[PDB]
Amino acid sequence: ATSASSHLNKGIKQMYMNLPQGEKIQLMYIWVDGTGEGLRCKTRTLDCDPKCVEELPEWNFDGSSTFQSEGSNSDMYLHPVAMFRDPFRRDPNKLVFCEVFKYNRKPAETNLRHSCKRIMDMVSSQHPWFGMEQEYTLMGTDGHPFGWPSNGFPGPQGPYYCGVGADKAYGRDIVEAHYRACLYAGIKITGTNAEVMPAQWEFQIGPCEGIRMGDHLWVARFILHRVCEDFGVIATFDPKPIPGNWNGAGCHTNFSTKAMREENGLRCIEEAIDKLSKRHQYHIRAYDPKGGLDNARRLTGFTSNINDFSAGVANRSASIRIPRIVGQEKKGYFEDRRPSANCDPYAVTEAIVRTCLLNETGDEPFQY
Amino acid sequence: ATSASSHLNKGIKQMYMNLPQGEKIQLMYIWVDGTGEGLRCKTRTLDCDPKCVEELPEWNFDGSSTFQSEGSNSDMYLHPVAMFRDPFRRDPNKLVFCEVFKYNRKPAETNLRHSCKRIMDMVSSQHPWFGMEQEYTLMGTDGHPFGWPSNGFPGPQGPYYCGVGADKAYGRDIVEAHYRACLYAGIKITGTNAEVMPAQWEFQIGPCEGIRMGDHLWVARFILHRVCEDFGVIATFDPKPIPGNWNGAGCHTNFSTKAMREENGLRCIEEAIDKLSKRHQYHIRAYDPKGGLDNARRLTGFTSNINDFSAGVANRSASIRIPRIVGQEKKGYFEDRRPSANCDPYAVTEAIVRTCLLNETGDEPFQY
Amino acid sequence: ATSASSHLNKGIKQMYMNLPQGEKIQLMYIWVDGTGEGLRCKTRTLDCDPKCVEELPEWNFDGSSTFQSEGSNSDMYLHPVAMFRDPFRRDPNKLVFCEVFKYNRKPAETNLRHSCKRIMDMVSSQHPWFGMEQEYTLMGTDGHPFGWPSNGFPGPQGPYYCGVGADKAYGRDIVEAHYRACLYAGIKITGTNAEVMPAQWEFQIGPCEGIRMGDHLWVARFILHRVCEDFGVIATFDPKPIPGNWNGAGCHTNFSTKAMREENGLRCIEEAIDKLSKRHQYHIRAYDPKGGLDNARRLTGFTSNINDFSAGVANRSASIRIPRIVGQEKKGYFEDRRPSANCDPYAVTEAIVRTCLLNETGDEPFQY
Amino acid sequence: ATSASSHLNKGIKQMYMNLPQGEKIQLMYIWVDGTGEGLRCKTRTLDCDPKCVEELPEWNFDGSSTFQSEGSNSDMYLHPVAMFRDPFRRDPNKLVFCEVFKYNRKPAETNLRHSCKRIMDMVSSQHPWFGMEQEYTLMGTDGHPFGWPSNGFPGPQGPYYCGVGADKAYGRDIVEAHYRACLYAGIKITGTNAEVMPAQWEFQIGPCEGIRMGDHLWVARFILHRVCEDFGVIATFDPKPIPGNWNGAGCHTNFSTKAMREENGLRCIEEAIDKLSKRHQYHIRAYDPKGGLDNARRLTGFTSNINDFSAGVANRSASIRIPRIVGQEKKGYFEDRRPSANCDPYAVTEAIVRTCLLNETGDEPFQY
Amino acid sequence: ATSASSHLNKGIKQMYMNLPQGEKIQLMYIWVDGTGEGLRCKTRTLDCDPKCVEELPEWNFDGSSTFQSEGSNSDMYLHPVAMFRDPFRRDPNKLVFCEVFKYNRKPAETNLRHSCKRIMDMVSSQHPWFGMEQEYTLMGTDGHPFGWPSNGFPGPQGPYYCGVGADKAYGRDIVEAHYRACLYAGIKITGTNAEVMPAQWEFQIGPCEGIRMGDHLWVARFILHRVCEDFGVIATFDPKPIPGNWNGAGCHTNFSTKAMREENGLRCIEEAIDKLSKRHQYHIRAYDPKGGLDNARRLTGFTSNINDFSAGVANRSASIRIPRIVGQEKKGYFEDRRPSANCDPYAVTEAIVRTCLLNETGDEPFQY
Numbered sequence A, B, C, D, E: 001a002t003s004a005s006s007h008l009n010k011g012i013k014q015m016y017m018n019l020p021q022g023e024k025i026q027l028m029y030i031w032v033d034g035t036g037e038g039l040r041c042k043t044r045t046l047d048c049d050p051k052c053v054e055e056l057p058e059w060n061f062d063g064s065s066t067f068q069s070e071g072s073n074s075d076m077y078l079h080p081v082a083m084f085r086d087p088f089r090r091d092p093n094k095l096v097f098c099e100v101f102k103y104n105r106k107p108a109e110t111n112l113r114h115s116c117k118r119i120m121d122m123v124s125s126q127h128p129w130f131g132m133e134q135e136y137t138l139m140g141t142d143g144h145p146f147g148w149p150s151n152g153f154p155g156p157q158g159p160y161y162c163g164v165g166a167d168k169a170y171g172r173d174i175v176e177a178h179y180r181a182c183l184y185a186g187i188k189i190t191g192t193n194a195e196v197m198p199a200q201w202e203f204q205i206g207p208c209e210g211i212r213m214g215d216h217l218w219v220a221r222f223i224l225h226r227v228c229e230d231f232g233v234i235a236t237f238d239p240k241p242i243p244g245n246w247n248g249a250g251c252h253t254n255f256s257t258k259a260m261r262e263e264n265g266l267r268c269i270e271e272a273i274d275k276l277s278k279r280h281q282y283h284i285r286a287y288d289p290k291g292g293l294d295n296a297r298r299l300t301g302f303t304s305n306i307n308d309f310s311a312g313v314a315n316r317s318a319s320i321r322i323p324r325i326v327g328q329e330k331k332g333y334f335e336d337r338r339p340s341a342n343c344d345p346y347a348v349t350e351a352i353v354r355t356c357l358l359n360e361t362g363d364e365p366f367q368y
């Protein structure tokens, strides 16, 4: 069951997009709404052919329509912070991820990018590298996963992981289109695979230094949403898209700095793991938009326990996993398997840096 | 009845694949899962534009999701061994067939390529050439062959063999696409034809010296699976896809060495045939993933008998067939008609070489 | 009602065929099965880029699957005799019409091309030119003509002959595609038209000297079959596809030699017509694969009578028709309207030459 | 695929038929058209409430519309000869099988009942008893058997004979309704079963003395036609409804007289069998409306050969079969397995009586 | 996916069955074909209104069409042995379960009722009571269980056992109709329930002394088949209708005699259980038509192991279960959980009596 807009003749759209647009450039403005998990987009025309993000002009939108402000002063300004080519409108047009701001220049409630960027500007001396493996479930318009039998379930799990075939991988066309669009847009995407759950996939955004990780992950999520809209399906980042004995959707996070990637860098990995063991409660609170409510359906064991912390080397069921190659070479990175699929990358990255590099302690972040 | 993902608009996918990806290269990693008949695929991005297979980096995957390992140490490393262009992502992207290894560098349970490669490295002085004619049945998502009437059977056998017409060949588009993809990828494919059973086809991988035969056959199987996934059907290698008076799916194997292709080389053919007559039980055990259980439904006579060995010149019903041209010219090769359609090419090729060139005897292989 | 394979997404097939195949060349081998009216095809890969037909290698196939041989020695060799470009695989790939031979080099039962070629090698001094107007009926997979109402008939005959419009010509796309494919392949096709019966068309293969007529007609029939398979319909050459007051499908034959096309050549036309009047029974026996059984449903008068011979100038209902322009100019050719639509062109052409140029008499052909 | 009239709401028809009609009585007049295998029906209202057939009035119809007469004098009179209750209009209304007569009181071309009744009036002293097992194929409106897969065939023969289950018996509702209607109408029906061919059934009309056999069989055929019309399918009496390896539809005939059912009556069975052996050609000519043309597709062996006569005890493949119980008890009847399913019962019964009781000889019947 | 005959308008069938048939009585003859698991039915008309089974006449049928005899003497006689009212044709018509016999009065290959009846005539002094709980799976015409999602599976097992609701019980209408038909026909049916597998039900035939158990169970199976045919689904008695983690279909058997139901009758239960422990191999061979081949897919543990025998009190996983109430009261019966769902009740009952009451020993039955 696909969307009604998907059944429109795409040949007409291809013919219309084949027109030479000319000097005019369409700038698609992207930002995060008040829910903290959704995205919003609207386009504008610019004729100067800009080169840098700082050249792009500020924009404003009605925040009362995005669950971001009341009716008194509902106007919210958009400050561009990321600059990417548009894969749905080819090279001349561009994708613009923006930072939401209130009417009085204050950061919005869901605008975690301001604090995240401040933290990484503080810690840039250590060069923190992040990589997050977003896992999403391809769902039809009917609320059930794509390709799943009507009013039923497919076979048991096990053949679907990284599977090839009509009965092993559902909606691979969406994944291929999203991969090509992310490569075209300049998103630092490293790879993709099919997860254990059928119609559930994964794409790994590559090492991005600091705020670039959150920027690239958010733009990749928007690109995936637009590709699924073109194909007529819905990509949901719910941690537990289907209750029962089905694999949950999570977003593991890899963390590494200059010392952790240097020779004999395992000691810093142990220090970071101990700090995360100390701040497990804060991290699990900050690893999803609902403060652990959504992640309680994925990290239920039977995925590490939500209420119990555990770490180890090459442990799939541990909250923090050290790659076996990292332990063998005594250097590399460590993977945080706690964050959910709908987690805000800015909050996750900020919490990881605060616990590791800033030695933060307590139950609340410290304002600097 | 095709897959639900097939009904997605392919024009959108074509438009997205028309984007210039640029310097980034997608490497699709392919390996054999724990079932020994299925295949798994997942992709990664590499920016160095590699030339040789040894340059490609090693990868790891969760073996517990592919019926290959337990939960203790479920990580399995991937060692690339074959290097091919990607027909589904054009020239810059590549297909990578990999060798599965355990966490402690030991070969996996289904990783027969290690022993096969060792054997052919031993016997490379004789230059063994192999060619296997894989026969597959095009099945819809409903478990019945493609193009077959709903809840029924088509006309009797005889018009469908190498037939041309709407009512004589089912799913020829898949066969043409697979042939073009195999030619593009560099797979040494020689030809194709429609088998006696409707919707059942065949493609013959050409003479490949040693381990290249298994590599090319496995990559061709993966390419066929991906093409059928694109078209929305399922290609099954079951030896007896439909019970009753319907032709079974098998994978005949041609074998030849330097002496067997030389002048007056028929004597070596007789020696090899006698050795296979001696080791019929071992060969029939090693000619399918289930140790003769699957092949018991195809080689039931009425196809040579599974429990009875027979060989001859230009004999269709014999286990080993000498081509009539080979007998006329007193040189050439001989065909082994016993292996099933789901047989692992590595095991078949290794058994043939062990019986012929290594003069192996007994009921178990000898470890060197 | 079209075939289930037709509903497959052809965009995927176009994308796969857009790949550059490279140096490898696919040779599609074509031959006539044991029924004498059907065709069989299977392809092979050749890397030498051949120029002439004699360079192409011989092939073999299982004759027991084509109603051509018993189980004792079921292998039948294929000897290429015609060389054509492949319209379904573009210029580098080629179509190969082959001559079927038994295991002991003897011509097959349905291999009339050997005797036909011998006869025309004998009579090449007179330069016999032949042209046959094959008429076929476009039928869906349901056994009823294409575009005909479900469980019914269209309007009465008369508007459909050479008609233009949605309600006047059924399946014109197949005819256009077949015409383009025949022109691309080098088939000497002269024209096409819609016959009186709806969904029944006709294409006229042009003057081809001797065995070339049979070769080109058979290759054109195969190309039509493949085009209909691509479009999902079935092209039947039955003489009476639909019983009742509907036009039958026939294949008229034009015959001319050097003297018949020369000045004052009408006398040779009268001599040939008298010889055919003498040998009407032999010709009507040899003008269809069933020895007049199939043609008894078309040549029933109400089309000349099957049991009565008649000839004249510009007579539609006569067995032999002299074109009015030929009579006016006292030179040209004459048309034989007796052969059926499923007639073997080799047998028809051989019988015509034997009666006209070889002055054959009796009820059986004379072996030379 | 059922008829369009079948999809009409039958609840409305039931409601309308629930009305009390009153004193008026509907008389459905039945007769055989010019084809000799079809039936025609039209009704009239009579208010006298008749008791005997001779009371019913004569009727007339346009014979030019039933392939029975030319346009000069196309009126044909109907003479009622059989009297039966109407199962489609309940007890007060009646079914009337009539005898067709020309304008000049001469019997029609297809009116074999006159000669048949004369013969049995001659031979009534011997009390000939006849029973014919009509076998019919339930076909949908699309020309393919009922319940058969679209554009295909069901499983092989063997499970369908007298089968019970959804996949073993097709259209059993029609058979049950026809059995109930025949029992209600007074037709001497003995039993029913499912034949080897799927959707092919059989009903055996019981021992009827003389002309009553033909009358009851024709009325039963009409009742079956009307029941199939109500259900929306077509009951065809073609001897070979589906070409190939499928069971044909035939109408075996049992014959017995007073001496043949008496003690030590086997000698008369041998005499009758010898007479039928003598007159096999006449019988096979007179056992179908087309003079053996239709039966040539059923009695092709592989059913006794059409051109070869054979008889025996408990022989299924013999033209004449003596039941094994009859041979054991030295009395009873013998079965004639030659007549086709579309045979006229009057002609079959008349030929059997002429050969057995009247000792007729030659190639043409003798007019008395 | 239901049968095409199910979509016929049942209002017409109801109207036709509403006719008063009168004095004529339809006798439906039922017997077991050569497969040993299927059933066959065909009807005849009798006008004497019989009271007892011995009054009914013998019948004959073509055994070559039921996989029961060769073509030499294919006639097989039917001897009625059970007498039941017909629920599909109301009170006047009757159901007749018959005993198949060869042409020479010898019992057929699948006619186990003769030996079973002889054994129970021998052992009638002890009054053996049997009750078998047949479990069947309601399957559509497509080969998948009724109500299951197309190309998929429903939720996991556990809510479906004896469930009530649209999503908990599939095809309850068939079960209710079958229960009513069995009660009407006089079948000693005790109860019904829905098994763990969805669309899989169970009906328990009550205590029937000796051969009556087999008779009633076979007639109940035929009634279930006819009811499913009316509703358009297929009732399969396969031991493992769906491979995987789904409950298998079995037919447990309760056994009790006069001593076992008397006071302090537990000792005889122990003796019988010990005898069955001794003869486990013979029983498991004789508990299905395929000699343990079918039951190997159901009794695989994970249902007691097929190769391991075990017995106990109130043990679900044991081959022989003593009911807990029986152990508490020291009297009653014991349940044999080994027989499969397609088991012949005659063979099961005969084996149980031979092991228990006749003290049979060895690997083959002893002919008396």
Ligand SMILES: [Mn+2]
Residues within 6 Å of the ligand: A133, A202
């Ligand atoms: Mn992963």
Ligand SMILES: [Mn+2]
Residues within 6 Å of the ligand: A133, A252
């Ligand atoms: Mn991972």
Ligand SMILES: [Mn+2]
Residues within 6 Å of the ligand: B133, B202
């Ligand atoms: Mn082959």
Ligand SMILES: [Mn+2]
Residues within 6 Å of the ligand: B133, B252
């Ligand atoms: Mn072969």
Ligand SMILES: [Mn+2]
Residues within 6 Å of the ligand: C133, C202
């Ligand atoms: Mn014309």
Ligand SMILES: [Mn+2]
Residues within 6 Å of the ligand: C133, C252
């Ligand atoms: Mn013409």
Ligand SMILES: [Mn+2]
Residues within 6 Å of the ligand: D133, D202
């Ligand atoms: Mn019969």
Ligand SMILES: [Mn+2]
Residues within 6 Å of the ligand: D133, D252
């Ligand atoms: Mn019979």
Ligand SMILES: [Mn+2]
Residues within 6 Å of the ligand: E133, E202
């Ligand atoms: Mn139970």
Ligand SMILES: [Mn+2]
Residues within 6 Å of the ligand: E133, E252
């Ligand atoms: Mn129970």
